[PDB]
Amino acid sequence: SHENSNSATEGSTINYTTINYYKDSYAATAGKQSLKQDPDKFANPVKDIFTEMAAPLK
Amino acid sequence: SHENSNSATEGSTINYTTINYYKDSYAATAGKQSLKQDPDKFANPVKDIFTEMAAPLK
Amino acid sequence: SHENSNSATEGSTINYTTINYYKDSYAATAGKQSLKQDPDKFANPVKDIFTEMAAPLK
Amino acid sequence: SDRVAQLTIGNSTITTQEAANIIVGYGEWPSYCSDSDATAVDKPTRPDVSVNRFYTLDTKLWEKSSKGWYWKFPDVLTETGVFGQNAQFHYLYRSGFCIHVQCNASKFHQGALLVAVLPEYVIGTVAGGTGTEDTHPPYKQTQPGADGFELQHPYVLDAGIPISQLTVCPHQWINLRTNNCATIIVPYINALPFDSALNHCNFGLLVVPISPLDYDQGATPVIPITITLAPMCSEFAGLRQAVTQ
Amino acid sequence: GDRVADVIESSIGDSVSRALTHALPAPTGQNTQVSSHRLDTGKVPALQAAEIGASSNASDESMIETRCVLNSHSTAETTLDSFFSRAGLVGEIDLPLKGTTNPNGYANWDIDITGYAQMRRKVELFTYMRFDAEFTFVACTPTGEVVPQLLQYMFVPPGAPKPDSRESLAWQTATNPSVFVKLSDPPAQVSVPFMSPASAYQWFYDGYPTFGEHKQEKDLEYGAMPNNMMGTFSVRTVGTSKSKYPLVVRIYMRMKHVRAWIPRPMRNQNYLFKANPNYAGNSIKPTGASRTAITTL
Amino acid sequence: GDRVADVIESSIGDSVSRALTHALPAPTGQNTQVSSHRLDTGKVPALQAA
Ligand SMILES: Cc1nc(-c2ccc(OCCCCCN3CCN(c4ccnc(N)c4)C3=O)cc2)no1
């Protein structure tokens, strides 16, 4: 498709597949996102990580 | 088609051919099933089978 | 087309070209038939044929 | 070869001389659950002897005016052995069954039974007879125990379905001229890999005489019917305190 | 370490289903082969023993004299998709002007196919079923007349707020689906997945859902598995004031991508209630017809 | 033309006499052979069915 990169996700590090007819990509479909996660950004953001078995405070 | 395997028959050992437009495969057509049978599952489920000619009880 | 051979002409020795969308071939178009004839089936069905010039009864 | 049979599982053993071949319900054998189908994470327990053996329930009588019976499995064994005393502790249950039925008679007696296995045999009441009065079946007719429960309207199996079509299930007959027992093996029949053993009742055994018992005086009138059965490939999960019901 | 022998030879831990049988193709009926006369001993296909509980195996070839016949009769229309994928009525929703059922311009319908017996008796041949679906909605006044009116539908899953009125806040449908549609337009029509927690819809549950001392006042929960109650279907006339027109809404189900299990017998007595196999006892009609003499037609 | 199959496999047109037996010579009576005692099961020539 010889359309424009007007969408909001232009610049993200995931891949979509969409369906479109107009030349403006913000009129495209939502589609499928790339399935990823990063819970250590909110659950274990510590500087010096620790091991499961060994106790944290030593 | 770069769609999802959301259908109910995902996991069956038969092959279909269908027509679809939306990304969700439970919106597809019924189609053609694979033509198979297994009457010995309901008619002759015995452990030790017997021959047509030779009498069963011996 | 991965459709079924449900049509009435399945078994005839002529060739058609048709247009269809549903999986059932009796929903197809009429189309073009093969142009053939056999007037000797109704006009000259005799056992021992005769020649144009030479008279029949001899 | 096809008449004589023997059945050895556990400490126990069964013999029989005038029998028939063995049936496998719905064409396959029991099994333990796969790691793909399963969902629970806890490690089950699998005793393999203390539970997988022949238990004997109760001995009925077959008069001339008899109508039929049923038993619900696996309710029959919830108060019997190390089987039952595991099924009260745990919450999840899986098993198969072998089912053997006895009825003997001489060569002057005549009759025929039908020994069928029906999954999810819900019981339905008569709606007061008139049809309007909504009712429900009591607890002692849905989980009657090991002592069994007798049918009232066997032509419809007490559920609006004929007995004429009960052969499509795993069935056998006991024609007293030919045989004297019926052996049926059944896998675990349910949509879920594990399920409770106290609330849910996966299938029901039926025993209905079609051609009635008959004889002549001077002959033994008491013609009992005994029911024997064995768990197989039994698993358990979800340990906690014992729950009667 | 498994150093004993009864642990090595053990059958425990067998995730395999020993299957005696195995499926085969059959796009056509079987072709009858040729036969001739036989006058032998031992060989005797007619004499069966049905006590075993297996069907016969005698055939036309081994009982009489046949000819060769090349059968081309298909077996494609006896499949399940070709037997079930045919729409039928499953529900009705009334939105009258002034009555007693649903006069305030809204109505809730509990999703349950078991209310009309043409479609119930087809599924009640089987026990466990796994199918997608395709509902279709036909709106009309009682006369069949078509009127310029706007309508809203809203799938209310379990655990969600059921609307209690026409001007409610549950109709914002931010997360629930919905279908606006008019009557001047064609029927509405949408697709449905397999929505259960289980692996199959069982039309027959022999048990109770909960634990407890099952008293007589709580026997109405016999035959109730919540893995089939797939929620509620709401509908209303859009607006702030009442409508000028009565309405009726009919719901049709079409099953596709079907898989079935557990054949079992078929109903012969009239249906009375839902989720309940009860029958009339004083009016047990036979399975079929009757006559006067076994020796005569 | 015999194009059907029930005509090809047909037993019609059999001018042959299927004989189970077949004649043998016998210019003299049979020579009695030697025997000894036997105390076996199964083998039992005396019991016939007429
Ligand atoms: C927008 C919008 N979406 C929709 C929309 C509305 C409804 C939908 O669910 C359709 C699911 C069909 C459920 C079918 N089953 C399975 C088991 N079962 C019963 C019932 C009662 N008793 C027993 N024993 C079994 C039953 O009835 C999906 C979509 N329409 O509007």
Automatic annotation (TrEMBL), chain E:
Compartmental location: Host cytoplasmic vesicle membrane; Host nucleus; Virion
Function of the protein: Capsid protein VP0: Component of immature procapsids, which is cleaved into capsid proteins VP4 and VP2 after maturation. Allows the capsid to remain inactive before the maturation step. Capsid protein VP4: Lies on the inner surface of the capsid shell. After binding to the host receptor, the capsid undergoes conformational changes. Capsid protein VP4 is released, Capsid protein VP1 N-terminus is externalized, and together, they shape a pore in the host membrane through which the viral genome is translocated into the host cell cytoplasm.
UniProt family annotation: Belongs to the picornaviruses polyprotein family.
Assembly and interaction partners: Capsid protein VP1: Interacts with capsid protein VP0, and capsid protein VP3 to form heterotrimeric protomers. Five protomers subsequently associate to form pentamers which serve as building blocks for the capsid. Interacts with capsid protein VP2, capsid protein VP3 and capsid protein VP4 following cleavage of capsid protein VP0.
Official protein name in the record: Genome polyprotein
Protein species of origin: Human enterovirus 71
